[PDB]
Amino acid sequence: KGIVLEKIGIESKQPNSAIRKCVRVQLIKNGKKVTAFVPNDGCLNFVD
Amino acid sequence: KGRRKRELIYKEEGQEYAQITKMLGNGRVEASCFDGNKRMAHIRGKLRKKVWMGQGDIILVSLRDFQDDQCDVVHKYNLDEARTLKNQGELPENAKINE
Amino acid sequence: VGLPYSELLSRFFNILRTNNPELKFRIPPPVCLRDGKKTIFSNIQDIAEKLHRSPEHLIQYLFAELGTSGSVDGKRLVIKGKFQSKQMENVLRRYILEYVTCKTCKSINTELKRENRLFFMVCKSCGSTRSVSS
RNA sequence: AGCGCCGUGGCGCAGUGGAAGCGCGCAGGGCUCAUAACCCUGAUGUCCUCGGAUCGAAACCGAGCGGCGCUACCA
Ligand SMILES: [Mg+2]
Ligand SMILES: [Mg+2]
């Protein structure tokens, strides 16, 4: 489990041009911060 | 290598004009946007190495409603639409570019 | 006894209110043109007038600040170099700060004069003699 | 105030006693598929003013101007 610190769009690698919706999230259990992809096309607006 | 007047485009609903300040690396750039921001612009595909840009070129930039400090280019003008929109003053007069 | 000091102070203040009711606010906005390789400044004559400054001395001072070359065309200055309007505005600000208006008191009516070969400034509202040439 | 220097083509040097110079700049062309490098052609002048010997001076000199460094404040 974690808390969404904010929402970002991270750009794809070289042979594929697109931006993938990801979330900068702070983990509850240990305090470390990480980034997370969100599948399922229309779901960044679900994140809140 | 090579053998292998269009209508101007206007800003709308989360999209505006920008002035490239410095050219970054790896296909990045910085644009002073006509909103009060020194935003960073990423170059989109079908346009990355399709149209060539340079510092001093008015840029049509789409924004990120989920990320306000980042934006990405959609279109570059060949210095004519810039003078045009300047005459109609779409972009504030405080930013003057000509060549 | 400082009583006869305040009365002549009052006399001076009435003199000031009589002579100078307005007590710069007359700097034309330097609207420039940066045509890439070229630069055209039309306001050069207006800033010459509203500051009571002769054109040739102003343009040579501009050329002395920045080592760029061009010509003078027409009532305008055509310099082929790269400068934002902000920086030429700044140069005009420096010239305004140190030439048109004296640092010590607010005045502007002073102009160029040649007092034994340089340009020695004198005023009209006051009668100053300051050796400002470079 | 006097003496040492000077009088651009945008610049710096120059031959300054035949009458327009060289490089740096700028416009244009050439080579290259193309760019830079390289190669060619250029238009710019009161060579500061006024007079004088001189066929003739920009040059040789002087009856004035302007800008530079010293003598140094030269009642
Ligand atoms: Mg084909
Ligand atoms: Mg993109």
Q: Which residues in chain C are contacts of B99 at CB distance < 8 A? A: 35-37
Option in A7, A9, A17 nearest B45 (CB): A17
Q: Which residues in chain A are contacts of B70 at CB distance < 8 A? A: 9
d(CA B89, CA B72): 23
Tokens for C50?
């509203």
- CA B72 to C1' D52, in angstroms, rounded, equals 79
Q: Which CATH homologous superfamily contains domain B5-99?
A: Nucleic acid-binding proteins (2.40.50.140)
CA distances to B92, C30, C40 from B98, in Å: 14, 17, 11
CB distance B17 to B35 below 8 Å: no
CB distance C76 to C57 below 8 Å: no
Which run of H or E residues covers position B86? helix B80-87
Tokens for C47?
């800033």
CB distance C62 to C78 below 8 Å: no
The strand ranges marked E within chain B are: 15-23, 28-33, 37-42, 58-64, 67-76
3-state SS record for C7-67: HHHHHHHHHHHHHCCCCCCCCCCCCEEEECCEEEECCHHHHHHHCCCCHHHHHHHHHHHCC
Local structure of residue B83 (DSSP, 8 states):
H
CB < 7 A from strand D, the residues are C 69, 114, 116-118
Q: Which of B16, B17, B43 is nearest to B29 (CA)?
A: B43
* Partners of chain C (3+ Cβ pairs below 8 A): B
3-state SS record for C51-74: CCCCHHHHHHHHHHHCCCCEEEEC
d(CA C73, CA C92): 19
Q: Taking the domains of chain B in order of start, what are their residue ranges? A: 5-99
| Cβ–Cβ contact B66 with A under 8 A | yes
Contacts of A17 (CB under 8 A, 6+ apart): B44, B45, B46, B48
CB distance B41 to B28 below 8 Å: yes
Experiment used for this model: cryo-EM
Distance from CA of B95 to the nearest CA of C (A): 9
